[PDB]
């Protein structure tokens, strides 16, 4: 018996065009457009926080080229 690894070959990174005034809700809506994930399946994470839908990217000091973390419900 031995051990091997398996990774997806598809690029998992999502690229978005946003404004600092966009809310986390709007960002989740844009993620759905590209990947087709319903908003209530996503939670966005950044700087060690669960980003709340009602706040803006500006509220979290999210600048250009930053990367957000995507949490999904497991089925």
């Amino acid at each position: 018996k031995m051990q091997i690894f398996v990774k997806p070959i598809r690029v998992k990174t999502i690229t978005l065009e946003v404004e600092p005034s966009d809310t986390i809700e709007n960002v989740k809506a844009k993620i759905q457009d590209k990947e087709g994930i319903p908003p209530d399946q996503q939670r966005l994470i950044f700087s060690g926080k669960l980003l709340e839908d009602g706040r803006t990217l500006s509220d979290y000091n999210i600048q250009k080229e930053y990367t957000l973390h995507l949490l999904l419900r497991r089925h």
């Binding site: 950044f46 700087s47 060690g48 926080k49 669960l50 000091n61 080229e65 930053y66 497991r74």
Partner: protein
């Protein structure tokens, strides 16, 4: 002054690195943007462990003379683990004072904490109760307890 400047420069560069190039399995950042020494982190229960899927919030507090001295870590989310005190404090060897070195970063610490969830250290555990259940009944009560912790953590994550 030099010590406060060195510690801040390192934490700053680390923060900027994680904002743009995060590492899979955790997110880390500042609780308050004006304080570089009080971090908060979200840790995902790694795959193929009893913690898999859990969303674990924790705090990571650095001294002014970092990297000479380690930070202290405390889980905010409730968790059942031998190396996690009942109060949430994380007692692992990499944070004493496999040991602490002035080259370790937030990323290096999370790698050790993630491995901890897969392989606890049996020397001087912080939760003797959890340590006993993990040695004697790993897939029974211990797995049951950890499963509850995991469920509760996912509840607050999608609130």
């Amino acid at each position: 002054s030099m010590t406060e400047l060195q510690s801040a420069l390192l934490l700053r560069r680390q923060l900027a690195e994680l904002n743009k190039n995060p590492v899979e399995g955790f997110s880390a950042g500042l609780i308050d943007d004006n304080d570089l020494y009080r971090w908060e982190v979200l840790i995902i229960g790694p795959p193929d462990t009893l913690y898999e899927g859990g969303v674990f919030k924790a705090h990571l507090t650095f001294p002014k003379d970092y990297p000479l001295r380690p930070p202290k870590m405390k889980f905010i989310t409730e968790i059942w683990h031998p190396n996690v005190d009942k109060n949430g404090d994380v007692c692992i060897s990499i944070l004493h004072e496999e040991r602490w070195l002035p080259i370790h970063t937030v990323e290096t610490i999370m790698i050790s904490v993630i491995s901890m969830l897969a392989d606890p250290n049996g020397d001087s555990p912080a939760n003797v109760d959890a340590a006993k259940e993990w040695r004697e009944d790993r897939n029974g009560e211990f797995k049951r307890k950890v499963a509850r912790c995991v469920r509760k953590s996912q509840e607050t994550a999608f609130e």
